[PDB]
Ligand binder design. Structure first.
Ligand SMILES: [K+]
Ligand SMILES: [K+]
Ligand SMILES: [K+]
Length: 49
RNA sequence: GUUCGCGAAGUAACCCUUCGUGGACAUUUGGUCAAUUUGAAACAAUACAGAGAUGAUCAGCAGUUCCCCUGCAUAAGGAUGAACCGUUUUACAAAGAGAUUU
């Protein structure tokens, strides 16, 4: 059963380290983007452009 | 300033001496640039993380780029120097059938 689980995991992978890091980096860049807009919106609502 | 010529004063008169006066000689430097904050050097420092093809550890050599750095360099080195990894819709037609409408 563990052999099958490990086989399914290794059979799934298709991208190397650089592409995988680019995926996580794009997700982090998006979360940073939304945090930036949240702070900017709070400031704007307070009349601070 | 010098020198050539002329007026004059001084001297008995020259030499010489002074005041005046004409000519000759010599003739336009330098800045793309002002002297600390506001016309632009960078490293470093603090933190986190710890290198592609892999199950794992790695040698690499390239290509593309409106990224270059070190080097005298057309050599070599810089993680295979780095970035590369995402997003993807129409030259759109033909034949036929069963339902919709006057
Ligand atoms: K490492
Ligand atoms: K390598
Ligand atoms: K190399």
């Amino acid at each position: 059963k563990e052999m099958l689980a490990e086989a399914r995991a290794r059979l799934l992978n298709t991208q190397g380290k650089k592409a995988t890091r680019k995926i996580r980096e794009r997700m982090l860049e998006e979360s940073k983007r939304i945090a930036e807009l949240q702070k900017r919106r709070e400031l704007k609502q307070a009349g601070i452009n």
